[PDB]
Design a binder for this molecule. Sequence first.
Ligand SMILES: CCCCCCCCCCCCCC(=O)SCCNC(=O)CCNC(=O)[C@H](O)C(C)(C)COP(=O)(O)OP(=O)(O)OC[C@H]1O[C@@H](n2cnc3c(N)ncnc32)[C@H](O)[C@@H]1OP(=O)(O)O
Length: 410
Amino acid sequence: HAFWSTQPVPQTEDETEKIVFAGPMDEPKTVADIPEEPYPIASTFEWWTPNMEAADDIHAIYELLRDNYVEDDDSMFRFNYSEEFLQWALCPPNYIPDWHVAVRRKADKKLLAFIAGVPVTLRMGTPKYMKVKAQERGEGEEAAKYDEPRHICEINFLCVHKQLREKRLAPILIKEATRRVNRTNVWQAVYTAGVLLPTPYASGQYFHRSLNPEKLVEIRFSGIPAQYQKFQNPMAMLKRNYQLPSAPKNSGLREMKPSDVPQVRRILMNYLDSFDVGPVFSDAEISHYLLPRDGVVFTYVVENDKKVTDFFSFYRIPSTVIGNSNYNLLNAAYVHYYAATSIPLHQLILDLLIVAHSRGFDVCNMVEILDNRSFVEQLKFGAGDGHLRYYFYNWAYPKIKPSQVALVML
Ligand SMILES: CCCCCCCCCCCCCC(=O)SCCNC(=O)CCNC(=O)[C@H](O)C(C)(C)COP(=O)(O)OP(=O)(O)OC[C@H]1O[C@@H](n2cnc3c(N)ncnc32)[C@H](O)[C@@H]1OP(=O)(O)O
């Protein structure tokens, strides 16, 4: 690892396994110690900070990701994050525009690479159980040192043009992004990836709940499981197995609206503070991340006797179906944040599935963070072949189960 061997991250699993306290990797620094000038690059390339209040700029990023962002190992599906989605994801309250870092070609101003950082406030102190192991050694003082939430950077949408792959461009992007974050006096970041890098503090497998199995089989996202072949019409029985009620079972379920924001913030933060790693949200950020938004984020509440008691949200990311004969797009819903006080979690997520299905989604996707693992079987989710790995930059963190992670990454 010619690049990651130089960075302040735990370098191996044997080393992450032997970590028992949260805290930084690198000795302190100041803004003064960080270069003022952007890092140098090829003569035909320049750095470009896009303006996310301008549809031209958003459009140029959209096209780069649409054609060059994450594909599956078979090159059959590729994320097609929408423009509305990108403006939502990249511009939460207090976002910093200088954290959105691009390289374009001088000659024709063509977008060639991208990486985005947005600020988040994250609890990232010693996990509860490692703290118990610590209170026993009288080391409680060290274990609790970094328990207060920290304002850090969340990195996403790293992307290099297919025609420029393997020219060490991503390390220059990563470094220039680090620089700009450091000049802002931020020293930690959180990020996720489907690939193994040095070194995750958690990993969760992906799970999928089929909503339109016929289409999913047609485009070869899924197949017909062998035991359906004992039927005269396997596809009919597969559809029956995945069939859903026509409308929600929970009366009192309604779309979220702005007046709901403080009660949703209350119940969410009670649920989220249960977990070792989880975000801390103000009313503004709750509003930004949960309030319905057409084609992007969908959020519903259970109102019992005037009070909000439960809620769920999901977000939409279609994927390009790469050269298919009947289909352009896979329409996928992704379980977002949620909270249950009045009903079992699986009864609440069953209404998420019913709503997603009625709004035309083909599949419901999730990672086994939060308590997602606990309803996989009750709700006929299938296990996928990929995992999402959680990483910290410049933060030593003990290994934890994904069910102790509460940060949903877009
Ligand atoms: C304090 C603030 C800190 C801020 C920074 C925090 C850290 C944030 C870090 C980033 C978090 C991003 C989270 C997301 O958004 S994850 C999703 C990333 N996107 C894609 O996979 C889209 C399709 N692929 C591509 O666009 C390119 O292949 C990419 C850009 C991924 C690599 O480009 P390319 O294929 O042309 O290679 P290269 O010659 O330029 O560079 C080779 C080096 O790159 C290392 N590499 C490969 N894949 C990844 C990866 N996914 N995260 C981190 N590093 C990665 C690799 O180990 C090697 O280093 P080493 O093996 O030599 O050591």
